[PDB]
Design a protein around this ligand. Sequence first.
Ligand SMILES: CC(=O)N[C@@H]1[C@@H](O)[C@H](O)[C@@H](CO)O[C@H]1O
Ligand SMILES: CC(=O)N[C@@H]1[C@@H](O)[C@H](O)[C@@H](CO)O[C@H]1O
Ligand SMILES: CC(=O)N[C@@H]1[C@@H](O)[C@H](O)[C@@H](CO)O[C@H]1O
Ligand SMILES: CC(=O)N[C@@H]1[C@@H](O)[C@H](O)[C@@H](CO)O[C@H]1O
Ligand SMILES: CC(=O)N[C@@H]1[C@@H](O)[C@H](O)[C@@H](CO)O[C@H]1O
Ligand SMILES: CC(=O)N[C@@H]1[C@@H](O)[C@H](O)[C@@H](CO)O[C@H]1O
Ligand SMILES: CC(=O)N[C@@H]1[C@@H](O)[C@H](O)[C@@H](CO)O[C@H]1O
Ligand SMILES: CC(=O)N[C@@H]1[C@@H](O)[C@H](O)[C@@H](CO)O[C@H]1O
Ligand SMILES: CC(=O)N[C@@H]1[C@@H](O)[C@H](O)[C@@H](CO)O[C@H]1O
Lengths: 142, 142, 142, 454, 454, 454
Amino acid sequence: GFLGAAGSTMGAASMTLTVQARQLLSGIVQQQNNLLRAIEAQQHLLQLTVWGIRQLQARVLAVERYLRDQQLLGIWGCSGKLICTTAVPWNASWSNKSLEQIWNNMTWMEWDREINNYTSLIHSLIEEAQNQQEKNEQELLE
Amino acid sequence: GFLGAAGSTMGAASMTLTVQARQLLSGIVQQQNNLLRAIEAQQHLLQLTVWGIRQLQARVLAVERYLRDQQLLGIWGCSGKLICTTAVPWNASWSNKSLEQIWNNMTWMEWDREINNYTSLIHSLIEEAQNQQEKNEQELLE
Amino acid sequence: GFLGAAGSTMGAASMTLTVQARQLLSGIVQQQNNLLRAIEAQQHLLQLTVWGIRQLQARVLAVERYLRDQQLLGIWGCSGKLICTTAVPWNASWSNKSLEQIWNNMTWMEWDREINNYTSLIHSLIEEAQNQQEKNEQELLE
Amino acid sequence: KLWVTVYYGVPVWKEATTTLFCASDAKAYDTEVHNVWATHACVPTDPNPQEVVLENVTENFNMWKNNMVEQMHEDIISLWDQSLKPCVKLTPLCVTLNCTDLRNRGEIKNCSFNITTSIRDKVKKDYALFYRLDVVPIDNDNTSYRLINCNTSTITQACPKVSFEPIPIHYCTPAGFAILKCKDKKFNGTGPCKNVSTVQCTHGIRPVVSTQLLLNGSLAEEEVVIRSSNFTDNAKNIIVQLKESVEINCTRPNNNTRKSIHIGPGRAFYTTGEIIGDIRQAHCNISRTKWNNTLNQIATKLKEQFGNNKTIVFNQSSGGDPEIVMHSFNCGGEFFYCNSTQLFNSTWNFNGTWNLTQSNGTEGNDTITLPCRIKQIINMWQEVGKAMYAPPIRGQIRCSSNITGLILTRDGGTNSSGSEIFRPGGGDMRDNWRSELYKYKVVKIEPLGVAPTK
Amino acid sequence: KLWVTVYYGVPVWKEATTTLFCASDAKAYDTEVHNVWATHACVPTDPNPQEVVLENVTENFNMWKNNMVEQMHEDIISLWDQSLKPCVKLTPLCVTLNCTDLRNRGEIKNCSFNITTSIRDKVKKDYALFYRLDVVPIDNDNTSYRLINCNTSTITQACPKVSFEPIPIHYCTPAGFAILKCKDKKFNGTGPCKNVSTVQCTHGIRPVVSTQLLLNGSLAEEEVVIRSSNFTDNAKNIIVQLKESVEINCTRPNNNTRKSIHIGPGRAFYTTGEIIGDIRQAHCNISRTKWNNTLNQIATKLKEQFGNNKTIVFNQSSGGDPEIVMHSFNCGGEFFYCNSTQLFNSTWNFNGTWNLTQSNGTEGNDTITLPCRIKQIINMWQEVGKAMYAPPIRGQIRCSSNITGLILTRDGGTNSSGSEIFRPGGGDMRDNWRSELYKYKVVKIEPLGVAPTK
Amino acid sequence: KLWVTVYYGVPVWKEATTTLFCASDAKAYDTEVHNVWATHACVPTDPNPQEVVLENVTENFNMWKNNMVEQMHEDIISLWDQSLKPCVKLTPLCVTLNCTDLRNRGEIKNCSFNITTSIRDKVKKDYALFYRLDVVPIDNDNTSYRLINCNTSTITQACPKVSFEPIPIHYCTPAGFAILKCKDKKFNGTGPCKNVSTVQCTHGIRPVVSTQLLLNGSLAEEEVVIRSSNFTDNAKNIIVQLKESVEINCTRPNNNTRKSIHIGPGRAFYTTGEIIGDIRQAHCNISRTKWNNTLNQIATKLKEQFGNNKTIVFNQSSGGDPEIVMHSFNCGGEFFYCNSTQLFNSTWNFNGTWNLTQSNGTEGNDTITLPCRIKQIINMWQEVGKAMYAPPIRGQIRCSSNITGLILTRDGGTNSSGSEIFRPGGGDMRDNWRSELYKYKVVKIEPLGVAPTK
Ligand SMILES: CC(=O)N[C@@H]1[C@@H](O)[C@H](O)[C@@H](CO)O[C@H]1O
Ligand SMILES: CC(=O)N[C@@H]1[C@@H](O)[C@H](O)[C@@H](CO)O[C@H]1O
Ligand SMILES: CC(=O)N[C@@H]1[C@@H](O)[C@H](O)[C@@H](CO)O[C@H]1O
Ligand SMILES: CC(=O)N[C@@H]1[C@@H](O)[C@H](O)[C@@H](CO)O[C@H]1O
Ligand SMILES: CC(=O)N[C@@H]1[C@@H](O)[C@H](O)[C@@H](CO)O[C@H]1O
Ligand SMILES: CC(=O)N[C@@H]1[C@@H](O)[C@H](O)[C@@H](CO)O[C@H]1O
Ligand SMILES: CC(=O)N[C@@H]1[C@@H](O)[C@H](O)[C@@H](CO)O[C@H]1O
Ligand SMILES: CC(=O)N[C@@H]1[C@@H](O)[C@H](O)[C@@H](CO)O[C@H]1O
Ligand SMILES: CC(=O)N[C@@H]1[C@@H](O)[C@H](O)[C@@H](CO)O[C@H]1O
């Protein structure tokens, strides 16, 4: 399940994340079978055009996007794995909606879309709310 | 408090770190409002000069510096958040100084400056002292 | 011990890893004493040839390899330190071999080599086995 | 408590507009041609790329708004330019010529002009074969013929070694961008799709340059599809997806000569030498019955706002550019131009059956036989500049091409509701490239996801 | 126990020497000029950049040692070069000319020389208007006039479409470098500062090229500031920061003609055509009272080591280059050169009041009126090479510029302690660019921090 | 339970094939020569690079398969090209010359040809000194002499300021690649090694261009080593590692003149002026006894398949290119070519002692004295194109070079088992560069490691 396994789901979509992540980041194998040094089998010219320099360039831009992803994981202290919470509550910004129904009938997309500037609104709080106002775990005895 | 909030402090300076970090790393928004594709409103030429190629180039050099920061966080096992200790004691290298006064009247800068080759002297020990000689936590019963 | 300290060992090789890692990643100091801006002492020309642009380019390629290393550490949740296990067992793929003897008389290399497509065979399982099927620690009572 | 929660590796699909990369299969790199018009040092296709079919999903596409065509044509132009760079120049081959019309309209006249040599002052004389399309008779001073391409811009060789044959090419996405492809057959350009099948590397295609038609392309099955960017807009080309394919025979019986003559310090010009034996003209024989079936299929497929299920009419292009008034393509390096005057003279308006032909009782002249043309020079993407020169193929040019698409232009210079007139339109050369891009849609993938969780 | 501890995101400020980036506001990209001498595809200024004022902080600055000026001028040169690249050349416009001095020193003589055309051999004759500064009379063979810029280097057009108007420009720092700006008004170049206000993107400026003065620049308030890199050093320019600003009228009443004449295959030269009506000379009228107040302010501000509070004397530059003996700037593409011979003839040594003027009882000739010059060619940053040609503005050139700074040079060829003589110095063109850079200081930011902690 | 476990920072060494970087010591950047044929803005050697000797380890090397030589020569060529770029051209210095053979085979004949000047039409006449190797007598029209390098390609100056002296150079590996170096003395090219000593930056070397020999190179100690890529293959060069070193005296007593004459707008040609005093020829005096000891050592070291311990024979190269039939090198910018006809005439087959010489009873003619040649132009790596011109050194050329290696070629045009004949071979110029690269092996470092652990 590169990108399927979630038509309208939040739980099933959440459980197929690793499969989607591994299927999506598999292009390095394709770059490995370049076989593309200078010729295919007998002869060849340079041919290196803006097309392929930009193939590598689009490669670089996307992998930089993944690098910015890793930097964000570092900023929030969220790089351990895909399972990582926030110390920030969902503002009543989003409209009244059932959560479980936001899950099952938002495909992650409907809740995101009409939380969308709400989802981002809840985004920036995390750095100085999960790291700035950074608490540990629960407060229990033994 | 991008960079203020600390005239001569170690505690207050330490508590305004997240604000300083978020204020400093905010240039990506500025890069987002480039509006700068090919023209301002009606006509335009290429104009792409060493000036702007080097704008992006200075961008690249600084962001590489932040990347080296992340690599160092990885080497020491120190990437969780800004709060991360060392298994290395401050050598009597630095001169006799009160710690709390080093805090309140060093602005982080005076203690750093006359620990400066001391601060770096204490730096390299961490990799093979916190990772090489890497112990867990405390040793207590229940 | 940049790379020595392990002729045929798995334990001693494992214990000299931090020394090897610190000795290997020490080229940044060499890049620091470039003294190489435009001239050595009195006069000089540009001379910047494909040789040195490619010195920096080989620098870039290797440091990108280390970056991919950090990305893999992130994918598995394995970036804390060199000590990080797998939720994947060694398939009976490798041939019958004593483990401790694989350690002491494989130099890490013999076990790797005839596990080699076995070692990689055991590699891909980790992402969806340590992160996909991701369990916590032990199950005990207090 | 709707505690906000963050998630990574989430399934997310967003509108991508990014670059795509080149992929050419192992059979590609085993073609062993230094470059047969198409191959590079680019990444080969991976042994087994994943095309996850996504079901119970929906995806809206717009092939005409898809940016894939743009990068495709740009990289095509970059590759052609970079391939022309190593080819030898023909600036001195530009010199005036004097052509004798030996074969007498046959456009086969041996031309013998001056071709210079390595030293500045040592020049000999040569003669090659030139058509009536490489040079023009001067009527101002009417002294000799001039290459049209030579009085307008520079002249250079077309890398005769680099044969212009079609090769399979694969476009891959970068890491984190997917290409969501519709799996639908009646799926039009700007439509949604449920047979989403995320594709890391788009399926291998056969970019053969053609005008008003398709050669060796993606076949649309289970129906005849007739799309257009604007049906009301008569100028809008009418893209058609035939169900089946026909057997073309753009094959020239006459042989070719090559006269590898060194011109510069290491530069040689392959002049077309004399042709052995009686020099006839290229012909073409095409099938009749399957074409009639496909025509009934389109005319039945044409009935869009047909008045009482009979308004289908076809006419030849009034005229215009040679590349837009006729079907041109490349086949063995020789730019074949098999004509298309046999399709404009037919009308399945009232009865698709009246115009249908029985295979068993095929007529005498049923097998479509029409004259087929060729060419030596060409300007890609209608770009006026330095031209090229196609060398000979030194042999009977046999071209076997197939049919899977069609382009029409509704007639605006006629009645609006009286009768629907379609005419061949070859104006837009990107309609050819977008016919197969109505399912693919570069799709972005974002792992970030917020969600109130307890 | 002083257990060493490590900290991240720490507030740290260190001496940065790095590149800065271009920023141009939304009003910039709404200027709609393909490029009015200044704009690019560069990043616009962000809607709301943060300028955190840092108080109870200290920061030492040195504008003369600040590297900002260097990258600024270099990127200016790179941008001007890259802008000149698309402009058409004037190499054949280099040909000899023959100018008739119709307007009779008026330096308005119609010149009619040969201007070539598209074909090699088809050449016609044209005439434009040229000044006495674009060509010189030959005294060796005294046959005609020659462009000075044309017997020394190449000639090319100055992109007449690209008008040389000043636009707002914003310099941003990279990610992790700040620009610490002093918020002080008597803050000199190499001084500390407590009004540190960290600035991600430096405040928008108006880089108008000028000599010995400032046009539409940062105003220094609450005092008159007179700095210099070395006051004892008489050669050191004396940078002055006036408190208020004056209303300049570098406005030419006479109109301009433009004769857009195609010269090359797509290249046109805007020759200055004839001027309608009686052709007079450019004038300039400037205010008197505010200038007297500012002069008293400087002379009071000049008293640095004044002997008994009266040593202030001014003199005209002995002579030298036109760009360093007078005030030059750009205004509407025409390089205006309003003279400055009205400021050297005044002396507020004994009484600042004796030289002061009452507005109510203003004299008859009080309104400063002096002759104002213009120019067509220019060499930026005193670089001897391929020159350019300013096209006409086809209209009465109205320039409105303001005043906020001044450059002087102490007189070394005089007594050391007898009388302080200041003369206009326009030698250093970076003193103009550094006058506003005495607060900004690129500052590095380092999160790493060690500290013995219990 | 063999629970798989993963480990990082593991000691791992794998076959690296990557780029290496330039390093030049502090003494380098203190050489103060803008570039003495070798130095750049490249990274200097670090004060104390780590060379961890790895013992109880094993490493197989193959210097002939080591890719270091390739990047080395390529970067050498890139640096030489980029250094030639700033040098002035000599295209007009190409003009015919007329040389008078004043010194009468002496190859010292003043030549006086036309050297052009700054203006197009103002040309004067000059004369310099040219050898018989820069120009040839024409026998077709026999009117004057022509530079051979000037009738075959372009001519340009050799940057006389850039003296071709040898400098120390250091090659560093990237971050994560090591260079495993054998610490063995009898360690051949394609062999294993136990004295592995991982080296981040390879030891400083002295790349002096030489043919069939070595100058100021790595000395192989504790034995004489005679390797070859194929010993049976007679064409295979026979690389030899002498134990000790000899004192060469490639020193020309006669002085040099330099005539710095401005030719272009800023371009000057250093013509060789007249030589003061009686002009004699360069000589060379070399030691006898140590050479005899080393020769006995090799002949004893040569006995590989010697028939009954006496098959060692040497002969002069039959002939061929000047760069492969004799020993050429650079010394002070003058390309010295001390001959090697004194080594082919000796035979230690039966008695190494019979051919040995006593130092105390040294003969009269024992001190090897042979003629020594020089040159002005050169083609690096046997590349036929634009040549260069060595300026004079204006002084007695004193070259002191040492000996640490040798190249031979077994004689194939002789008996297979009768007598082993070695002849000087200078064909392969990379055998010189690989002689010192038999221990270094770029080695990859991988921290990843799997291992069943309980
Ligand atoms: C918000 C939303 O979509 N709600 C629908 C609901 O109307 C429908 O009855 C139910 C059936 O499964 O599916 C839910 O997703
Ligand atoms: C080391 C140092 O700076 N010590 C000063 C101390 O002299 C002063 O009495 C006190 C007042 O608050 O402030 C401290 O910072
Ligand atoms: C698998 C292997 O290498 N086994 C050897 C074993 O044969 C030998 O007796 C022993 C002595 O220490 O060393 C072990 O490493
Ligand atoms: C209308 C439509 O969706 N048709 C597709 C067809 O193109 C595809 O080949 C097939 C594979 O199973 O799946 C069908 O659903
Ligand atoms: C009537 C006729 O000539 N038919 C031939 C057919 O037999 C052949 O198989 C085909 C190949 O494309 O070409 C057609 O022209
Ligand atoms: C001497 C000085 O520092 N003056 C500044 C002034 O320039 C600034 O505009 C103002 C803003 O509040 O703050 C004052 O302190
Ligand atoms: C005496 C005189 O002419 N004064 C005018 C003034 O009225 C005008 O507002 C100003 C515009 O800059 O220009 C001055 O020259
Ligand atoms: C044959 C051999 O290995 N010789 C090496 C020698 O080259 C090196 O200088 C020495 C350093 O201790 O170590 C010896 O083992
Ligand atoms: C016989 C003779 O001339 N011997 C000299 C020797 O004294 C000198 O030290 C050496 C320098 O390289 O050069 C030799 O030629």
